Amino acid sequence: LLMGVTKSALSTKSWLSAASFQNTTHVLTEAAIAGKKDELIGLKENVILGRLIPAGTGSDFVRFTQVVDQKTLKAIEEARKEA
Amino acid sequence: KEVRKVRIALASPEKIRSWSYGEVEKPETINYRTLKPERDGLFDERIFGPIKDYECACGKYKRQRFEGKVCERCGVEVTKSIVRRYRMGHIELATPAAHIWFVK
Amino acid sequence: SDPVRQYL
Amino acid sequence: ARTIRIPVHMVETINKLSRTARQLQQELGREPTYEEIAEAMGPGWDAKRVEETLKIAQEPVSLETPIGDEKDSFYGDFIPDEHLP
Amino acid sequence: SMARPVSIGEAVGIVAAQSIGEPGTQLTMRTFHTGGVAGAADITQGLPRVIEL
Amino acid sequence: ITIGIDDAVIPEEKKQYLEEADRKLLQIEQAYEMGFLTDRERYDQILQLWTETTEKVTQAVFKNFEENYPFNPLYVMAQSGARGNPQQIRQLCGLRGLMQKPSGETFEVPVRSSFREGLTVLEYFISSHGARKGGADTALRTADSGYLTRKLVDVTHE
Amino acid sequence: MVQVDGGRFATSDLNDLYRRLINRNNRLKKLLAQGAPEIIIRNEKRMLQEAVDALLDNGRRGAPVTNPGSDRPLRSLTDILSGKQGRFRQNLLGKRVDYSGRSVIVVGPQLKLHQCGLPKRMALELFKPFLLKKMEEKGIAPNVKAARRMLERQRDIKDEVWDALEEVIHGKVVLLNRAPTLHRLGIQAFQPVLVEGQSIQLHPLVCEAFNADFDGDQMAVHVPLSSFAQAEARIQMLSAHNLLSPASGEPLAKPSRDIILGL
Amino acid sequence: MEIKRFGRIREVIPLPPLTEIQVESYRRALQADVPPEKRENVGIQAAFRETFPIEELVLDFLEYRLGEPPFPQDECREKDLTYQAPLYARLQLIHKDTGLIKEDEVFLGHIPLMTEDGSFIINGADRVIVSQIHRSPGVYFTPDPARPGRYIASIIPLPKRGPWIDLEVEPNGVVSMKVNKRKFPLVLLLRVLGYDQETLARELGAYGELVQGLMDESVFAMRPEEALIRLFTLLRPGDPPKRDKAVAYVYGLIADPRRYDLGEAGRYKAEEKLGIRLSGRTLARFEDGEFKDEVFLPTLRYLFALTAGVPGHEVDDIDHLGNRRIRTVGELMTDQFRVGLARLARGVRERMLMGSEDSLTPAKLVNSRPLEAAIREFFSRSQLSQFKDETNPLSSLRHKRRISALGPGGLTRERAGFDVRDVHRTHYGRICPVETPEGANIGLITSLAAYARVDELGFIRTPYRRVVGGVVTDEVVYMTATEEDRYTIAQANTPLEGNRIAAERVVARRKGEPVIVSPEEVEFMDVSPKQVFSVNTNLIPFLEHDDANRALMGSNMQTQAVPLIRAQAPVVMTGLEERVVRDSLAALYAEEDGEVAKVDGNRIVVRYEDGRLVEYPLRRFYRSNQGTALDQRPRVVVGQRVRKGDLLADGPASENGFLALGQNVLVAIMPFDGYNFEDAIVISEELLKRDFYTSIHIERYEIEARDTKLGPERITRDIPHLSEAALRDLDEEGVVRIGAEVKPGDILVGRTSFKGESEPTPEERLLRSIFGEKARDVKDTSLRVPPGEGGIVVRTVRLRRGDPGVELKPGVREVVRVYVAQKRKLQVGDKLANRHGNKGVVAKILPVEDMPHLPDGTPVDVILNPLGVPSRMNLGQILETHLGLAGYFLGQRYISPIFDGAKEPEIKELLAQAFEVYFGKRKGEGFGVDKREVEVLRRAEKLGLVTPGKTPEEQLKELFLQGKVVLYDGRTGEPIEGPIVVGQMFIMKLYHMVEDKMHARSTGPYSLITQQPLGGKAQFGGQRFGEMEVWALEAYGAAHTLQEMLTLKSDDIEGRNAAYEAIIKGEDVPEPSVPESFRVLVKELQALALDVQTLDEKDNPVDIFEGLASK
Amino acid sequence: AEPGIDKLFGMVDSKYRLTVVVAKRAQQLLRHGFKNTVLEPEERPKMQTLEGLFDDPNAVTWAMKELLTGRLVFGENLVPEDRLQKEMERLYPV
RNA sequence: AAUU
DNA sequence: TATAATCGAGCCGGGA
DNA sequence: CTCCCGGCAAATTGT
Ligand SMILES: O=c1ccn([C@@H]2O[C@H](COP(=O)(O)OP(=O)(O)OP(=O)(O)O)[C@@H](O)[C@H]2O)c(=O)[nH]1
Ligand SMILES: [Mg+2]
Ligand SMILES: [Mg+2]
Ligand SMILES: [Zn+2]
C-alpha cells in the first residue's frame, strides 16, 4: 500500500502523535472508541508528556552507561567478592 | 511508579460521576458584591476546592494542622488551592444528550 | 435545519 | 443575561440610571456628569452612588478576545498569574 | 555531518525532514534575492511537483 | 577592492549586437506582414532572437573583463564566488534583457538599458511586473514549503 | 474568572457555554415537573442538545454560538484542543521558556568559531540565579536574598559583580537560535564572551547555516541549565563540532564574501 | 551653499495637494461650512435622505447641523478625548391620522472631525483612515472558465447595499439567474417585470439559438402576479407566499433605493457599458402598482450579442483601474453613518407601538445610541482606521496616501491570489509600482502616485498634456484608465524644441503597450516621470539605476527614519523634498507679507500688512505616536522681513524647509577587517562626538489609583519600608520631580494598595513583630522604571476626581502620567539605511585614528562594504557618492530628478572642478605628490585605471573622475593598495534601535491556564521555543536540553521551583516532573467525556495528580 | 573546538554515549566536591581570576579532561547502581 | 501593521 | 395579576 | 459528480 505523508502520518499507531498533527477530533474519536494505548515509541509522544525523547542521550542504547574510576572500581571489587 | 503508556477511552456516566466533586446546580459564577464564588455555581469551593491554601471559605480552619477536614459551616476542604485545576464537577441532564463527535 | 423555523 | 448575576431590583435600578442619562444627554447635547445624573435621579442620589452603580454594572470581558494584528494572540495571554508563587 | 559512521541513537527521521524541507523554503524566499528577469525553472514550479510526489 | 560607476564596463560589442538584433527583428516583422509566420510564430521568433542576443552580450562582458580587466571588482567578486553571478553582472554592464508580463508570458520588447546607463520610466515600469510577481511568489510559497516540512517531520519523527 | 489590573473582570468563554447549558437543563426540569405539552418539552430538549453541542464543539453543527453584540464564536472545548492555536501545537509541542533572551545581532570578526559576543546586561539576567550563589561565596553579599536586592536597582550595581559573573559563565555555553529554524543548525552552541553594548555578536562563518545577515536580524539566547544539558550543548551542539551539512555532507561552515575575496 | 539643479523637463503643473485624498473627501462628506439649503445629496446629507421618512405616525428629516468642538485639538490629546463635533437634526413628527405636527431638534451624538493635515484624534490618539480599493459597481462580463465559448454577466452593487447577480447560459440552453446562492431560469424574472413573449421574442430574436433558451411556455401562462408568487416560493422555502409578502421581499431585493444601492459610479458604468440610461441606482422600480424593468433587459441583450461574437462587445478586465475604484475617507465613514442611521430607524418603529400612541415628540422617539455606536465602532475598531504613523513627517504623509484592498468589503489575506497583487498596466500614473509591503501583504497595500487624484466617482485619474498636431499644449487633462486607453500617449522625455515635438520618432503607449510613433500620431504626453511613482519612491535620486526590489526597500525605509537633532537634507535631492515638508504641515510659514515682531524658543509673533499682530506658538519636544520627538524650531530673527509663504519655523526632520531624514556623511566603499561582513556597517566615533545621528525619544508612563473593596489606592510619598535614597526625587505628593534622572527600578509615581484579606502571613506577622515595626495595612504598588528604560523627566500630568474639567472611568480616583525623555547617541546595533535600500546595523565604532583617511588628514565617517552592491544591483547609491564627492569640495548640493537627472559627463565635469580644489590647494601650499600616492598609482595603472605615462597629477585626476581617491589606513599609515571610492552619502538612522529590542529573562510572569511564561518584552516574557526549535534539539539528539525546555524552564511548576532553589544553593538542577500543560490537556479531555489514563508497564493507572483529583 | 574532541569520539561507539559518560561524571565530581578526581594537581583545569589561577569551577570541563587520560572506565552493567553510590560516599563524603 |  | 393582543429575520484535497 | 470538512512557515513588535 502506498499512501502520501499526510495520510501515512495520520495512520500511525501512536494517537498522541496523530492527534497533534491534524484532524484532531477525528483522530481522537477513533482512538477513544478503540481504547487505544499509546506506547510512547516515537518523539512527539514523549515531547508532549515532557519526557526524555528516545534519541541522542535518551536512546536506551547509551542511556544507562556507567562511569567509574579505577580506585572506586577496586574499592567495590574486593568488598563485593569478600562477602 | 513510572508512566510508560497513555490510554484514551470513552467515559461512562458512572465514571463521569466518579470524577465529579459535586453537581453544578446554578448558572451563577461569583457574587456581584462580595466577589466571592456563589454556592453551587461554576466556581463553588465546596465542589472544586479552596481558593486559598489550607483555608476554608468562612475561615474556621485556617492552617495546615487541618488538612482533610471539611468545614461544617462553609463546607470547604482544607488542602492546596492548586486542586481548583484538577477536581471536576458534573451536570446531571434531565434528558440524555448525544456527544457531537460521535454523531457528526 | 433552523431551530426557530422548525418550532414555528 | 449577565455572567455575574445581579438581583432583579438592582438590574431595575441600572436600567433606570441608563434611561435617565440618555434623557440628560438628549437635552444637554453632551454626556452628563455623575452629578448631573444624581440630580436627575432625585433624592438619595449623589455622584458617588451614581459611580458605584456603574462600577457594579460592568460586564466581564472574554479572555479569548483577539488582540489587534493577525488573529495570533488572545487577551488572556497578557495576564500574569498573581496567585501561584 | 561527521563524515563517519552514524552513531546509534541519532534521530535520523527529523534530520531527513529538515534536510529535505530546508532548501524548499530557503529557495522560495530567494527567488526575490534574484532579479525579476525571466530565465525559467524556479523552485515554485518544482516544489508543487515535490509536494505532488 | 571598491565599486565606482566606471567599474561596470559596457562592452564595445553591445552596440554592435543590438544593431545586429534590430536588423534581425525587422526581417521577422516583414515575414509577419507578408503572412509567412503567424502571430504565434512571430512572437516565438522574437523571444529566441532576444534570448541569443542576451547570451552574446553576457559573454562579451565576461570576455572583456577577463582579457582587459582581470582584477575588476565586479569580475573578481563574481569569479571568486564572493558575490554576484553572471546574470546579475550582465544587468549592471550589459542589457537587462527580456522581462515578463504578469501572466508569465514574456514581453517581446526587452529592456535594452543597463543599470549603469539607467532605465527609461517605461523600461522601469515594465520591470516592476516581474519584481512584484517574484515578491508575491516568495510570500505565497513559503507557506507551502513550511507546511511540507511539517508533514515530513510528522511522518518520519519516530 | 480573574480580576485584571484595573479591577475589571475577564473570563473564559467556556463559562458562558456552561451557563447556557445549565439554564436550559434547569428550565427543562421545571417544564417536566409542571407537565408542559410535548411541543414545549420537545423544544426545550432540542435546545438542550444545541447547548451541549456548542459546549463540546461550537460551530460544528448549526450556527455558532456568540456572545451578545459580537460576531466572535465562543471558544469551545474542541477549538481549544485543535489547530495552530490549539493546546497541542501551542502549549505542548512548543512553549515559552525561562532563561532566554533576544537582541539585535552584529558581526564579531575577532571571535573564535566556538564563541559569541553576549551583552553583559543580558548575561546578568540569564545567569541571575547562578550569579546570586557566587555573590555569596565571595563576600559581595551577606546571602542570596540580599544579593538579588542589589541587582534590582541599576545604580546599585558595583563592578565586583561583573567579575563574579565572569567566573560563573566560565566554560559554559549558551544557545543561539535565529528563526526560521529550517534545519538543526538554526540552533548552535557558543561559549559566550561578555561585551559592553546591547548587541549579540555572531561569528562570520556561522552566518550561512543560520541564514543570518547584519541588515537588522535578531537572535534568541538560551541557557542549558543542568550538567547534562551543558554536556549536550558542548559536545553535540557546539558550533565548531558541526562543520558539515547533515543533508549533503559538504562543508557548511566555510569561507564566504570578504574571506573568499581576500584570499 | 549653491544648489545646482539638473534636468531638461519643464513640468507644466505642480504636484496636487498631497493630502487632498483625505482633506477633500471628509469635507465633502460633512459639508459643515455649506448652508443647509445648498448642500448636495452626498455624504451625511445623502444618508439622512435615505433613512427618512420613517413610516411604521411619520417622522421626517428637515436638516442637520454640526456644532463647534467642545475641546480644541491639543486638549483632546491631553485628556484622552475624541476630537469631534456635536451633530443635531431638526425632525418633525406627523400623525398621518390627526395632522398633528410637533417639531424639535434632536441630538444624535458626536461626529469625529479631521484635522488640517488629514488625520483624526480618537480617544487622544492620532489615527488615519486608509482609502480602500475595491471592485467598482456596474455590470461586468467575464469568460466562463468551465465552458470556453460562453460568458457570465455580473451585476454588482456597492458593498453591503445589495446582492451579486449572475446570468449564466446553461448547457441546456436556458438563461439562469443566481441570487443568494440559489439558481433558477431567468425567464421567470422577465415575466414578473411585465415582459410578454411578444416583446422578448421580437427584441432578442436576432440571436438565433439563444432566444429559444429563454422561451418557457409555462411561465407565460401566468400573469406577473402568479410569476411573483412562484419566484418567492423558490427563494424562501417554508415562508407562506402571501401576496403582500412576496412584493415586500422581491422589492427589497431589486427596486428599494434603501436596501439596494448601485453606485453613482455604478450607474455611470452601467449606462456606459450597455448604452442605456438608468433612472436610479436600482436594477428595477415599483411604479404604477407593478414592477417596471430598468437594468435586466439591457444586460441580457449584451450577453447574447457577445457570445455570438457581435462586434462592439468585449469582456471586462476586472483588474483594470477603470473597473476598480477607491473608497475614500468620506465614503467609508458615510457607510457606517448609514448603518447607524438604519438602526435608529428600527428603534423609531418599535417606539411608535409601545407607550402612548398619542403623546410622542421626536425627542422621545429617537435614541441615538445605535448611531453613536456605529461611528464609534468605525473609528475605534475598524480595520481601515489605523494608528497614525508619525515617526517623521513623511511617515504620516505616506500613510494618508496608502490604498488598501483589505478591510470590511474587500479581500482577506488567505483569500487573495496573484491577480490582485500584480502590477496592472493601468497602474501607470495612478498607483505606484514600487512602494508596497514586503511579505504577506505585498500588492494588497499600495500608495497613490504623486500626480494622481481620485475623482468624485472614485476612479484614480492621472494628468496628461494635450498634443494637437505636433504642438504640446500646456492644458493638462486628468484621465481615468478607461478614457486613457483611447489615445496614443508619448513619453515625457520625448525631445522638444519650444512647444513643438523635436523628434521624428517618439516612444508612446497604446493601452499601456509600448509602440514607436510619428509626431502626427501623438494625442497626449506624460506630464513628468514623477507621475508614475509614489512620493517615497520619488525621493530616491538616480532611481533609474536601482533594481526595483531594492528601490522598494528605499521607499519604505524613509518612512522609518528617526528625526535627528542635527538632521540635514541630502546633498543629492530630487526636488520634491521642499513640497513634502510644506504639505506635511510640520513646518510653519508666513500667511501674508510682513515683519517679524518677536522670536522665541516657544513662539514667533509676526506683524502683517494688515497691521494685525499674529502669534504662532511652536510645538516643542512633543511626543509622537512612535516616541520620536516632534519639535519645531524658529528659523527667523527679530525684524526679519518675510514674504507670503516664507519659512518661519523648521518642523522635525526638516532643515531650512527641506526634508531632513538623515545626515550627509563622508563614506568610503571598501571592506574593512570583517566589521563590514554581510551588510554590517563601520562608523567613526567622530559621528558621536559631533552628535550626528542623535535623536530625542520620549516614553510615556501611566498609573491609576482606584477604589477597591479593600479601600482606596493612594498616590503618596509614604511607601512602606523605603529609604530616603529611594524616595529622594519624589515631590510632596509622591510624583518624581521634573528634571530628575530616572534609571531602571526607580520610582516614578508612589502608590499604596490595601493588602488583601489573606493579609500578612502569620510568618510575616511574627517576623515584623521581632523587629518591632508592627505590620502595615498597605503594600507598595508604585509605578517603577522598566528594565532598560529611563531618562530625564520632562513632564507630569495629574488628573484626579473632583478637580475642574476632569471625570475618569468609574472607580478611578486619579490618573498620573510621566513623560520621560532620552537623547540617544548612535550605538552598536542601531540600523542605518540610504535611499537605495542599502541597510545595515552598526557593528563597530572606530576611534578617529583607525578610520581610513584622505592624504590631507580628513578621516572618513562610514565604511560600507562593496559586496553589498553587485548582488543588489542598486547603483544609484554609487552615483550618489560620486556627485556627493564633487559637492563636498565645491560646497554645493544638487537636485537630480528621477529619470531626468545628472548624467555621467555632467558628473565628471563637476568632479574635475572639485579635483582642482582638492589638489591645487596642496601644490600651492608647497607639497608635492606623496610617495605612497605614487605606489597606489603604480598599482592603479596595472589595473587600467590611469593612462601610463602621464604625470601623477594627471593620473590622480583620472582616478578622481572615477570617484576614487588615494586612501591611507590610519592604523599603518600605508596606503590602501588601490584607489577607493569616497564621497558624501545620505544615510538615515532607522527606528529599529537595540535599546528597544534587547531583552532577557531568568524567571518572571506565567500564564493563568498553561503556567508557561508570558510573551514579549513588555510583559517580561520568555522566548517561544516552538515546534521547529524542538525539532532542532531533536535532530541534535539533545534530549536533556529539550526536556529542560519542556519542563523546568516552562510549565513544570514543581520542577522550576526546585531547579531555581538548587541553583541558588549551588546544587545541580533536579530531574523534571510533569508539565502542567499536560495536566491541562488531561482535564480538558475529561471535560469532553474522554478518559485519558497514564499507565505503567503493568498497565496499572499512574496518578499524575498525586491524589489531589480523587475522592 | 573542545580540546581533544576528536579523540573523545574515538573512545566511544556512539557520540551520544560520550555525552552520557561526561554528563554523569561531571555530576559525580560536583556531588563529591571534586575530591574524587582522577587528575593530578598539575592536571587540574585552571581558571584565571582577578586574584589569579584557581580551580576550574566547571565540572563538565574536568570530566572531559579526566576522560582523555584513560584512567576512567565506562560501560554497561559494571556494578549495581546503589552499591556504587554508597562506596563513593565512603571514600569522599559530602 | 512591522522586523528577519 | 384582566380591553385585546396568536408562525422570525478563499483555494484545495480528500472521502460518503 | 457533488458537497462537506479539514488543511493552508517561523520568531518578533506594536496601539
Ligand atoms: O517572511 C520571511 C521573510 C524573511 N525571512 C528571512 O530573511 C531573509 C530575507 O532577506 P534577504 O533579502 O537579504 O535574503 P538574503 O539574505 O538571502 O539575500 P542576499 O544576502 O543573498 O542578498 C530570508 O532569507 C529569510 O530567512 C524569513 O524567514 N521569513
Ligand atoms: Mg543578506
Ligand atoms: Mg536579513
Ligand atoms: Zn468554613
PDB file of N, CA, C and O in Angstrom, chain G residues 104-133:
ATOM      1  N   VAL G 104      19.460  42.357  18.950  1.00  0.00           N
ATOM      2  CA  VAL G 104      19.936  42.504  17.588  1.00  0.00           C
ATOM      3  C   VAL G 104      21.315  41.862  17.475  1.00  0.00           C
ATOM      4  O   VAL G 104      22.133  41.957  18.402  1.00  0.00           O
ATOM      5  N   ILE G 105      21.602  41.210  16.334  1.00  0.00           N
ATOM      6  CA  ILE G 105      22.918  40.615  16.130  1.00  0.00           C
ATOM      7  C   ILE G 105      23.750  41.522  15.246  1.00  0.00           C
ATOM      8  O   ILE G 105      23.249  42.253  14.386  1.00  0.00           O
ATOM      9  N   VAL G 106      25.042  41.457  15.510  1.00  0.00           N
ATOM     10  CA  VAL G 106      26.132  42.235  14.950  1.00  0.00           C
ATOM     11  C   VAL G 106      27.297  41.275  14.680  1.00  0.00           C
ATOM     12  O   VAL G 106      27.504  40.315  15.435  1.00  0.00           O
ATOM     13  N   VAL G 107      28.065  41.515  13.599  1.00  0.00           N
ATOM     14  CA  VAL G 107      29.228  40.652  13.292  1.00  0.00           C
ATOM     15  C   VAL G 107      30.379  40.871  14.272  1.00  0.00           C
ATOM     16  O   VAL G 107      30.678  42.002  14.679  1.00  0.00           O
ATOM     17  N   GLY G 108      31.045  39.782  14.631  1.00  0.00           N
ATOM     18  CA  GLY G 108      32.148  39.776  15.568  1.00  0.00           C
ATOM     19  C   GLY G 108      33.365  39.065  15.000  1.00  0.00           C
ATOM     20  O   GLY G 108      33.742  37.986  15.462  1.00  0.00           O
ATOM     21  N   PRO G 109      34.113  39.759  14.139  1.00  0.00           N
ATOM     22  CA  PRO G 109      35.186  39.105  13.379  1.00  0.00           C
ATOM     23  C   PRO G 109      36.236  38.479  14.239  1.00  0.00           C
ATOM     24  O   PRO G 109      36.805  37.442  13.872  1.00  0.00           O
ATOM     25  N   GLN G 110      36.512  39.085  15.373  1.00  0.00           N
ATOM     26  CA  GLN G 110      37.541  38.636  16.284  1.00  0.00           C
ATOM     27  C   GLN G 110      37.210  37.355  17.018  1.00  0.00           C
ATOM     28  O   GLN G 110      38.072  36.847  17.729  1.00  0.00           O
ATOM     29  N   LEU G 111      35.987  36.852  16.927  1.00  0.00           N
ATOM     30  CA  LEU G 111      35.616  35.674  17.696  1.00  0.00           C
ATOM     31  C   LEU G 111      36.248  34.403  17.163  1.00  0.00           C
ATOM     32  O   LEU G 111      36.434  34.235  15.967  1.00  0.00           O
ATOM     33  N   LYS G 112      36.552  33.482  18.052  1.00  0.00           N
ATOM     34  CA  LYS G 112      36.833  32.157  17.524  1.00  0.00           C
ATOM     35  C   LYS G 112      35.509  31.415  17.216  1.00  0.00           C
ATOM     36  O   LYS G 112      34.433  31.733  17.747  1.00  0.00           O
ATOM     37  N   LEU G 113      35.594  30.403  16.352  1.00  0.00           N
ATOM     38  CA  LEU G 113      34.383  29.752  15.870  1.00  0.00           C
ATOM     39  C   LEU G 113      33.467  29.276  16.979  1.00  0.00           C
ATOM     40  O   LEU G 113      32.253  29.215  16.790  1.00  0.00           O
ATOM     41  N   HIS G 114      34.000  28.949  18.135  1.00  0.00           N
ATOM     42  CA  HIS G 114      33.185  28.446  19.230  1.00  0.00           C
ATOM     43  C   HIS G 114      32.677  29.575  20.135  1.00  0.00           C
ATOM     44  O   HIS G 114      32.197  29.302  21.246  1.00  0.00           O
ATOM     45  N   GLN G 115      32.816  30.844  19.717  1.00  0.00           N
ATOM     46  CA  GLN G 115      32.464  31.938  20.603  1.00  0.00           C
ATOM     47  C   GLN G 115      31.336  32.833  20.079  1.00  0.00           C
ATOM     48  O   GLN G 115      30.980  32.826  18.891  1.00  0.00           O
ATOM     49  N   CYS G 116      30.737  33.592  21.002  1.00  0.00           N
ATOM     50  CA  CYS G 116      29.831  34.664  20.616  1.00  0.00           C
ATOM     51  C   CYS G 116      29.998  35.852  21.553  1.00  0.00           C
ATOM     52  O   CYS G 116      30.470  35.705  22.680  1.00  0.00           O
ATOM     53  N   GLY G 117      29.709  37.046  21.046  1.00  0.00           N
ATOM     54  CA  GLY G 117      29.563  38.183  21.930  1.00  0.00           C
ATOM     55  C   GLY G 117      28.224  38.206  22.644  1.00  0.00           C
ATOM     56  O   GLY G 117      27.199  38.273  21.972  1.00  0.00           O
ATOM     57  N   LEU G 118      28.200  38.223  23.979  1.00  0.00           N
ATOM     58  CA  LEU G 118      26.970  38.255  24.771  1.00  0.00           C
ATOM     59  C   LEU G 118      26.934  39.496  25.663  1.00  0.00           C
ATOM     60  O   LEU G 118      27.821  39.657  26.520  1.00  0.00           O
ATOM     61  N   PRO G 119      25.986  40.424  25.473  1.00  0.00           N
ATOM     62  CA  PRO G 119      25.926  41.632  26.315  1.00  0.00           C
ATOM     63  C   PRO G 119      25.944  41.346  27.806  1.00  0.00           C
ATOM     64  O   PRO G 119      25.358  40.373  28.269  1.00  0.00           O
ATOM     65  N   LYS G 120      26.712  42.150  28.551  1.00  0.00           N
ATOM     66  CA  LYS G 120      26.858  41.861  29.963  1.00  0.00           C
ATOM     67  C   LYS G 120      25.518  41.969  30.655  1.00  0.00           C
ATOM     68  O   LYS G 120      25.157  41.110  31.464  1.00  0.00           O
ATOM     69  N   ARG G 121      24.720  42.966  30.268  1.00  0.00           N
ATOM     70  CA  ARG G 121      23.420  43.161  30.895  1.00  0.00           C
ATOM     71  C   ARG G 121      22.475  41.984  30.648  1.00  0.00           C
ATOM     72  O   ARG G 121      21.753  41.565  31.559  1.00  0.00           O
ATOM     73  N   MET G 122      22.478  41.424  29.440  1.00  0.00           N
ATOM     74  CA  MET G 122      21.762  40.177  29.180  1.00  0.00           C
ATOM     75  C   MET G 122      22.259  39.024  30.049  1.00  0.00           C
ATOM     76  O   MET G 122      21.455  38.287  30.632  1.00  0.00           O
ATOM     77  N   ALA G 123      23.578  38.848  30.151  1.00  0.00           N
ATOM     78  CA  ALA G 123      24.098  37.703  30.890  1.00  0.00           C
ATOM     79  C   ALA G 123      23.743  37.805  32.362  1.00  0.00           C
ATOM     80  O   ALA G 123      23.417  36.799  33.018  1.00  0.00           O
ATOM     81  N   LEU G 124      23.739  39.017  32.893  1.00  0.00           N
ATOM     82  CA  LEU G 124      23.365  39.148  34.285  1.00  0.00           C
ATOM     83  C   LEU G 124      21.928  38.636  34.520  1.00  0.00           C
ATOM     84  O   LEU G 124      21.664  37.951  35.519  1.00  0.00           O
ATOM     85  N   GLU G 125      21.001  38.880  33.591  1.00  0.00           N
ATOM     86  CA  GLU G 125      19.661  38.348  33.805  1.00  0.00           C
ATOM     87  C   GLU G 125      19.625  36.849  33.562  1.00  0.00           C
ATOM     88  O   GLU G 125      19.194  36.085  34.426  1.00  0.00           O
ATOM     89  N   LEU G 126      20.150  36.407  32.417  1.00  0.00           N
ATOM     90  CA  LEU G 126      20.088  34.994  32.045  1.00  0.00           C
ATOM     91  C   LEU G 126      20.750  34.121  33.103  1.00  0.00           C
ATOM     92  O   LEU G 126      20.407  32.950  33.226  1.00  0.00           O
ATOM     93  N   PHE G 127      21.870  34.563  33.673  1.00  0.00           N
ATOM     94  CA  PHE G 127      22.538  33.743  34.679  1.00  0.00           C
ATOM     95  C   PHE G 127      22.202  34.123  36.132  1.00  0.00           C
ATOM     96  O   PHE G 127      22.792  33.550  37.059  1.00  0.00           O
ATOM     97  N   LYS G 128      21.226  35.015  36.350  1.00  0.00           N
ATOM     98  CA  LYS G 128      20.929  35.593  37.671  1.00  0.00           C
ATOM     99  C   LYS G 128      20.960  34.603  38.837  1.00  0.00           C
ATOM    100  O   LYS G 128      21.705  34.848  39.796  1.00  0.00           O
ATOM    101  N   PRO G 129      20.296  33.455  38.792  1.00  0.00           N
ATOM    102  CA  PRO G 129      20.403  32.522  39.923  1.00  0.00           C
ATOM    103  C   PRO G 129      21.816  32.064  40.181  1.00  0.00           C
ATOM    104  O   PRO G 129      22.200  31.928  41.343  1.00  0.00           O
ATOM    105  N   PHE G 130      22.571  31.708  39.141  1.00  0.00           N
ATOM    106  CA  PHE G 130      23.974  31.342  39.334  1.00  0.00           C
ATOM    107  C   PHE G 130      24.752  32.485  39.968  1.00  0.00           C
ATOM    108  O   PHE G 130      25.550  32.287  40.895  1.00  0.00           O
ATOM    109  N   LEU G 131      24.489  33.696  39.496  1.00  0.00           N
ATOM    110  CA  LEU G 131      25.189  34.867  39.977  1.00  0.00           C
ATOM    111  C   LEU G 131      24.949  35.101  41.454  1.00  0.00           C
ATOM    112  O   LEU G 131      25.880  35.424  42.197  1.00  0.00           O
ATOM    113  N   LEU G 132      23.736  34.845  41.926  1.00  0.00           N
ATOM    114  CA  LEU G 132      23.457  35.039  43.341  1.00  0.00           C
ATOM    115  C   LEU G 132      24.331  34.135  44.202  1.00  0.00           C
ATOM    116  O   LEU G 132      24.959  34.599  45.148  1.00  0.00           O
ATOM    117  N   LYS G 133      24.400  32.847  43.891  1.00  0.00           N
ATOM    118  CA  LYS G 133      25.278  31.976  44.663  1.00  0.00           C
ATOM    119  C   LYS G 133      26.715  32.488  44.683  1.00  0.00           C
ATOM    120  O   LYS G 133      27.356  32.516  45.738  1.00  0.00           O
TER     121      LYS G 133
END
